[model samples]
Target chain A: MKILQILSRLYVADLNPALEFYEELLETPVAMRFEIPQTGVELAQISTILLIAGSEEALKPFRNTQATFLVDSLDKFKTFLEENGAEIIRGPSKVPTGRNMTVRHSDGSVIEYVEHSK
Target chain B: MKILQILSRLYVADLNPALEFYEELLETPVAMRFEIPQTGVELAQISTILLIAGSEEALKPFRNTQATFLVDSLDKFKTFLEENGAEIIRGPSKVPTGRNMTVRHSDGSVIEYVEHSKIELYF
Candidate 1:
């Protein structure tokens, strides 16, 4: 009757590579990590509960989803992403509301990094 | 250097309609809701903090994103969605790992409803 939990899942061609990007590159702390053989899925080495399916078929439903993150500094965040090899898709431009930049992750997913200027 | 909070935003043509769907229809209790006139965005009436932009251009970056919800009863959830006029996009089929279905909300975004057996439960 009521919607409870809302989560996002990403399907990757290779789980390890994606893990490296999110873990080593992005430095996202591992909340938990494990393999679900039954579902043929892998949790990120850091965020165990955040689901990542191994193959395209398993992750098809997640296609075209963007995970938006709000950060304190756009410059520092842009530098970190660049050092990690994420391709810059768009600007760190001044918008009416905030500063935003778009990038493509190693897995080919598009992520928009936004920093709100207070 | 560290990835912290991961949240999602939806861009809708009409903010009030979306608030009605997520709040009244889906019955998702509003954790918070407020308007950020500075960003020209409206937060849901119930969940004020979850940002919902009022225009497509404002929400362009979130385009093509799907918000997946985990639920207990797929049949009951499906019925609630159908009653609210959501169009069924896919099945309540038995997949190798679990049972899943997909639906299109009034705003034209796709949402996948998944119920995993204990073996694949990640919640």
Candidate 2:
């Protein structure tokens, strides 16, 4: 678990024109927005993860895309995703960008494991 | 449209242990590979877009994932995704390591717009 920084989450039906088309097409300088009512949609960071498509329920069983990694250890990466059978589905909880988890990749593909408390 | 480095595509039922679990869990080494027989899967480029779960019809309907970019200008990023409504779907054609196109992000998220051409896709 040395995966440092690999943020990728894009599920947007309408989050202010996909956050103004990726903040003027990744010109940066957006960093983070608000309204992440614990996965009810309304998040718009610049270079990665921008969700706002309602009823997504923490991104509906992970098929669209979610790869938010920055780990050093989330209980040893959730015991390496339960020894690679893979299916943690929700999280270790806490996510203002800290203790995260959402795994299920046997081919379902949905990962968001972060431990960046810095 | 100037996103020069944004790579994230992970659709792996099995691509050599998911490319060795992302090359020793993202120590990052294998920076390119082969086998994309039009869209049958077997691509292995470490760091981004390592697809290997075929028949996705080049990643069908903006679903699984594909965010490949290294652009200065692919015809002005294909006229900025057709003036921003978004929907290119597939190809500016050609794909040994250069010339690609797969766009559809009116919030559907399917992007892979390269223009490298360094050449060495021995599949």
Candidate 3:
């Protein structure tokens, strides 16, 4: 898979405080922010960190994903990941920013890879 | 603080198995490897993943740290982190890579920021 950037994931119960902390810590403003009502979660991307805020139920769907990879192609990663013994657990489907796939690596670390539409 | 990069941290019981997996997965050779007898852990950096291997006891101290940041200055970070409501959990002490400090953010996320001495693995 052609990976562009690997972002670290942070889970929080609320976005406002976490967002404020990271913005000052990284010395950067939020690069992107969006809400996923269906999942009952809100997200904010600040520098190399992806802050995920939601209720307990909403956060459960994302807890297993340890990190996020901005990749060049989901198709390429799907074939390559499967061939390498990584199981595609979710999506080759659409997401707010792009198409994504959550893969469980052979070592059991789950990571989400996305190809940004923008 | 001049933040360089943030690396995702992964903990495993064994280094060899985890190391091999990331090497092939990232299409990159092992950039660095070293054992920390003090912490009873071995670390390998392959691409953006910092794979840390050790027993349960050995990994306990490290489990709280969520990510690793390569930074330009620890002094700057110390001032910036404390002023910004981050608690300094560990170090401004010497580590295998260089001087390091672990900070806990107000949101309870723990992260380690290091200024590598002479090592240049990130490039």
Looking at model 3 chain A, which ten-residue stretch has the lowest summed lDDT? A30-39
DockQ-based CAPRI category assigned to the predicted complex of candidate 3: medium
Deviation (Å) of B118 in candidate 3: 3.2
Order candidates by TM-score, high to low.
3, 1, 2
Candidate 2: misplaced stretches above 4 Å?
A1-25, A33-45, A49-66, A69-86, A95-99, A108-110, A113-118, B2-7, B14-51, B54-67, B70-72, B75-93, B96-123
What is the C-alpha lDDT profile of model 3 across B1-123, one tens digit per residue?
A: 688888898878898877777777677875577534366678887787888877878878887787999999999989988887889988888876678888888777788888888754345
TM-scores of chain B alone in all candidate structures, in the order given: 0.44, 0.31, 0.87
Per-model C-alpha lDDT, please?
A: 0.52, 0.66, 0.81
Candidate 1 lDDT, B2-121, residue by residue in tens: 223333445556655455444542345454553232265454433321445556676664454455454566787677667655677788877644676777754344665656566522
Judging by DockQ against the true structure, name the best candidate.
3
TM-score: which candidate is best?
3
Off by over 4 Å in 1: A1-65, B1-65, B120-123
Q: How well is each residue in B17-106 modelled by candidate 2, as lDDT tens digits? A: 666666655666565766354555566677754554555564564344446767866778788778887888777877666677878777
Interface quality of candidate 1 as DockQ: 0.09
Clashing pairs in 2: none
CAPRI rating of model 2? incorrect
What DockQ does each candidate score versus the true complex, computed on alpha carbons? 0.09, 0.19, 0.58
Clashing pairs in 3: none
Q: Model 3, range A25-95, lDDT digits (tens) per residue?
A: 78897568854435668888899789888887888878777898888888988898899878999888876
Candidate 2 lDDT for residue B115:
74
| Candidate 2 lDDT (Cα, 0 to 1) | 0.66
